[PDB]
Amino acid sequence: GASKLRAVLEKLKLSRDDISTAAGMVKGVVDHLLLRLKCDSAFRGVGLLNTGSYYEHVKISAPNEFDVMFKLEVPRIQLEEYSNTRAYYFVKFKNPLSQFLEGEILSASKMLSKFRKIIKEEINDIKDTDVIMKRKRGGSPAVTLLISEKISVDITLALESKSSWPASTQEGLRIQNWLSAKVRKQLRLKPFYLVPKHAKQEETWRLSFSHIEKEILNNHGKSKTCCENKEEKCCRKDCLKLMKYLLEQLKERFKDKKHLDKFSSYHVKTAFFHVCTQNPQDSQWDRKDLGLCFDNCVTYFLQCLRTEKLENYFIPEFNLFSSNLIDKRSKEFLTKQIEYERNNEFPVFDE
């Protein structure tokens, strides 16, 4: 019940200082690397995009792991959808990237290879930081830093396009009844990002809207003053934290076979945004209703698992839970675990 969930939230707060201290160390190294790249390199136009769980104020664990995005301002990009994937594209131009062009198409593999080598090069001049390599993951994260051989920092390179968003997003970002049609128009005037990502041989890039995800989470109410005063304290962020923690704790129980390896915090975050669409009123997220609101989040996530459908919040035809991405057996296994936990008041949360 809600008392147990409040106790979980209190336990998560115990880690706040370790996470923010580690975030400061990451920022020091990231800033140093950025300055090396901007001064003189093939990536002079690089900039820091402050996106991800820490900047959304929902990173509640893993102080030795951070995800960082670098953006690269590029001239006007023309996109070509890869097959009917909706989220993966070839990048053409209508420039300082000609080196990575093959014909008209900007090569993600060439850009990624240059990026990794250049970062390796600059890191040799930076204190107690080394480049390590994790699983390629289609090209994003591009490269991993290890700081004082403790903190792993995944760095993603993203091209910034200031053009209007691709057609596949036309029916996405269904925030009109929650955050307003005015806000949806405002957000769609912002740039979008392209991250090098294999689509599952090809030089494809995947759309990224991490900056918009941050904006929503940090300005998340129907009321503009949601969470700015004691009368409008909602539980949206608490629910996302509890959903992330639920998944983390379930994965912890299968560290041997890693049966839940295909599931990510991004799945939980995406499902959470859909529940915000379904429950657009701040009165549907009253902090006094934490237990009901968390149940709303858990039951919607269960629905996604059972129906094998979790639409990307910005690209509705990109199904994160399609059997091409996550096998049916894994989704059924997670359904059984979450079903049991929900029916028993989340004993995974017991002390």
Ligand SMILES: [K+]
């Ligand atoms: K070094």
Ligand SMILES: [Zn+2]
């Ligand atoms: Zn709020």
